[PDB]
Amino acid sequence: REVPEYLNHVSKRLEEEGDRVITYLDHSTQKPLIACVEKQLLGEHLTAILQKGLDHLLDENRVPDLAQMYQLFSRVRGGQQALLQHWSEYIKTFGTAIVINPEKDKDMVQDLLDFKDKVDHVIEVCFQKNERFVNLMKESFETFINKRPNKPAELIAKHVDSKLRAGNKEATDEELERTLDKIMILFRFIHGKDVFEAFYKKDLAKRLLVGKSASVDAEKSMLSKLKHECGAAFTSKLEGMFKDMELSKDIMVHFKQHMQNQSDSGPIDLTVNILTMGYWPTYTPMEVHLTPEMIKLQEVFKAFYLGKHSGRKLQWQTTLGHAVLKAEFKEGKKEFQVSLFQTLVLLMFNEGDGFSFEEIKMATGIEDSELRRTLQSLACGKARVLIKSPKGKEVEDGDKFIFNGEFKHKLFRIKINQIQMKETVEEQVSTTERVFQDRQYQIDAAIVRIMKMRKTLGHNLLVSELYNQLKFPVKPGDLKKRIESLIDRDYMERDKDNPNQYHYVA
Amino acid sequence: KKRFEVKKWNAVALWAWDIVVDNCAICRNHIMDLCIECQANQASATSEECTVAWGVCNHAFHFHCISRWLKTRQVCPLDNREWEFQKYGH
Ligand SMILES: [Zn+2]
Ligand SMILES: [Zn+2]
Ligand SMILES: [Zn+2]
């Protein structure tokens, strides 16, 4: 017979051989008898019972059946012990195949979360919360997620990012704090949170600079939540990204109260955000031709900032800019929310019309890599503002763009700005190199930090500390490589004559 | 008349301390040019690992000319804000 049914027959015999002792049997016998039954329906096949029934039970969610199994197996010698073994090796096996195929990374996180739920939920009901099991679920859970080096951490982030952007689905706070806490509990399992921070940061900046978030007080808890169970320096940066936002406001108010008493002419409402170079991600400056009207504004501001804030230097980042354009069409008058790179291009069409990629790349001054997609929108995608002559999914060299005349759009204020929030493959790779080529210093700098604490230490007794201090792996290859650099530059040394002991050496 | 002006215009800019000719400031060569320790082949040939480190105080320096300035003291040698290290990379 199958198992759910076999385990039922066992809880039956035990009931009968039990309700037998009460009747015609001597209360003495109950102990020997029951041990016998137990050691013939359970002992003698535990291994055999799990090996061919547990798996199926779990990935099908037979709650009741799991319980009878827990209770029963518990009564035997190493029954509860053996039930762990399988359960854990089950979690890992099914868990591994959730995170090891690059092709399935899209579903990576959600499926991890949902699994964790089934698993947890079985521990509550089916295993009565036995903590030996929580230990193993936790422990094992971290053995399989980390069989896949860096994606987990990354993805977790890109996932959180989709929870804080513009969107209706996250319409309540009670549960947003939950879906947020549920993730955080996964987080803890990952190795390479320095990768999480990496993409996390990168994704906030884009959120803080281009287009709103779910909630202000919401985006805050997240930090609060990371500060806790991770470090105050881990989040040090992000906390700063925000401050800069508060300051940029302050300043902005003053520049306006000052700009007030000037009888003003400027038709452009300019709002500027000033960021602390060390906190925020690294940004590559792009040279572009800004309309005269534009430069001026930016200059007057610069003067206002450099003055009142002596000892500083600015550097405008066009990549992150965005603006609002009023458009004069037929059957409309709409206004667009466009990136800087988009704004420029479009403007050409005021005192112009019908242009070819090349003649465009000449006059503002973008970059092929970008101008393409910056142009891929405006046309191709949704096909709505601009029209591409050699019409095609992509953009070539001749392709002419015509100022469209369509507009049936039932709106005002369109957001073409989507381009500004997509991480290209380049961005991705780059924002990963600056973490592998980052760990190196974090290792070195962390080595030195400890060496000072205790002037003399054993190698394997160090590799241990690093596993606690760093927020990542640390290949034995790389470490070896590190002590090298530090002995050569005179920060530490091998003394007492045994390559397993190290002395600081100020 | 125009088929497209500009109503709002959000701009972004990053600030950094203006430090005369952006010098390594501890070795005062250049923020991005070997260093001293590196620039001269003494007993240290690790010029490959020579980049900028920024502190919380926000002035940057070569990871090298600075990791040194830490054994002895421990405070952004231009700031007073005790160093702490938030970013590697030019
Ligand atoms: Zn160097
Ligand atoms: Zn400084
Ligand atoms: Zn230096």
From Swiss-Prot, chain A:
Keyword field: Biological rhythms, DNA damage, DNA repair, Host-virus interaction, Isopeptide bond, Phosphoprotein, Ubl conjugation, Ubl conjugation pathway
Q: In which pathway does it act?
A: Protein modification; protein ubiquitination
UniProt's post-translational modification comment states: Neddylated; required for activity of cullin-RING-based E3 ubiquitin-protein ligase complexes. Deneddylated via its interaction with the COP9 signalosome (CSN) complex.
Q: Which GO terms describe its cellular component?
A: Cul4-RING E3 ubiquitin ligase complex; Cul4A-RING E3 ubiquitin ligase complex; cytoplasm; nucleoplasm; nucleus
Does the entry annotate any disulfide bonds, and if so which pairs? none
According to its UniProt entry, the protein's GO biological process terms are: cell population proliferation; cellular response to UV; DNA damage response; DNA repair; G1/S transition of mitotic cell cycle; hemopoiesis; in utero embryonic development; intrinsic apoptotic signaling pathway
- GO molecular function terms noted in the UniProt entry: ubiquitin ligase complex scaffold activity; ubiquitin protein ligase activity; ubiquitin protein ligase binding
Q: Where is this cross-link: Glycyl lysine isopeptide (Lys-Gly) (interchain with G-Cter in NEDD8)?
A: 452
Annotated Cullin neddylation domain residues: 438-498
Does this entry carry the keyword DNA damage? yes
What's this protein's function?
Core component of multiple cullin-RING-based E3 ubiquitin-protein ligase complexes which mediate the ubiquitination of target proteins. As a scaffold protein may contribute to catalysis through positioning of the substrate and the ubiquitin-conjugating enzyme. The E3 ubiquitin-protein ligase activity of the complex is dependent on the neddylation of the cullin subunit and is inhibited by the association of the deneddylated cullin subunit with TIP120A/CAND1. The functional specificity of the E3 ubiquitin-protein ligase complex depends on the variable substrate recognition component.
Q: Which family does it belong to?
A: Belongs to the cullin family.
- What is the protein's quaternary organization? Can self-associate. Component of multiple DCX (DDB1-CUL4-X-box) E3 ubiquitin-protein ligase complexes that seem to consist of DDB1, CUL4A or CUL4B, RBX1 and a variable substrate recognition component which seems to belong to a protein family described as DCAF (Ddb1- and Cul4-associated factor) or CDW (CUL4-DDB1-associated WD40-repeat) proteins. (Microbial infection) Interacts with Epstein-Barr virus BPLF1.
Protein name per Swiss-Prot or TrEMBL: Cullin-4A
**Biological classification of the source:** Eukaryota, Metazoa, Chordata, Craniata, Vertebrata
Curated annotation (Swiss-Prot), chain B:
- Offer one example of a GO biological process linked to this entry: RNA polymerase II transcription initiation surveillance
- What GO molecular function terms would the record report? cullin family protein binding; molecular adaptor activity; NEDD8 ligase activity; NEDD8 transferase activity; protein-containing complex binding; RNA polymerase II-specific DNA-binding transcription factor binding; ubiquitin protein ligase activity; ubiquitin protein ligase binding
Keyword DNA repair part of the UniProt annotation: yes
What are the EC numbers? 2.3.2.27, 2.3.2.32
Per UniProt, the keywords (alphabetical) are: Acetylation, Cytoplasm, DNA damage, DNA repair, Host-virus interaction, Metal-binding, Nucleus, Phosphoprotein, Transferase, Ubl conjugation pathway, Zinc, Zinc-finger
Which pathway does it serve? Answer: Protein modification; protein ubiquitination; Protein modification; protein neddylation
Q: Name one GO cellular component term.
A: cullin-RING ubiquitin ligase complex
Binding residues annotated for Zn(2+) 3, in chain numbering: 57, 59, 76, 79
Annotated zinc fingers (RING-type), start-end: 35-80
Q: Which residues bind Zn(2+) 2?
A: 35, 38, 50, 64
Where is the protein found, in the record's own terms? Answer: Cytoplasm; Nucleus
Which positions bind Zn(2+) 1? 24, 27, 62, 65
Catalytic activity field: S-ubiquitinyl-[E2 ubiquitin-conjugating enzyme]-L-cysteine + [acceptor protein]-L-lysine = [E2 ubiquitin-conjugating enzyme]-L-cysteine + N(6)-ubiquitinyl-[acceptor protein]-L-lysine; S-[NEDD8-protein]-yl-[E2 NEDD8-conjugating enzyme]-L-cysteine + [cullin]-L-lysine = [E2 NEDD8-conjugating enzyme]-L-cysteine + N(6)-[NEDD8-protein]-yl-[cullin]-L-lysine
Name the reported effect of residue 57 to A.
Answer: Strong reduction in ligase activity
Expression by tissue: Widely expressed.
Q: Result of mutating residue 59 to A?
A: Strong reduction in ligase activity
Which cysteines form disulfides? none
- Which protein family is it in? Belongs to the RING-box family.
Protein's job? E3 ubiquitin ligase component of multiple cullin-RING-based E3 ubiquitin-protein ligase (CRLs) complexes which mediate the ubiquitination and subsequent proteasomal degradation of target proteins, including proteins involved in cell cycle progression, signal transduction, transcription and transcription-coupled nucleotide excision repair. CRLs complexes and ARIH1 collaborate in tandem to mediate ubiquitination of target proteins, ARIH1 mediating addition of the first ubiquitin on CRLs targets.
Record comment regarding domains: The RING-type zinc finger domain is essential for ubiquitin ligase activity. It coordinates an additional third zinc ion.
Q: What is this protein called?
A: E3 ubiquitin-protein ligase RBX1
Q: Which organism is it from?
A: Homo sapiens
From the UniProt record, report the name of the gene that encodes this protein.
Answer: RBX1
Q: Which residues of the full protein are shown?
A: 19 to 108 of 108
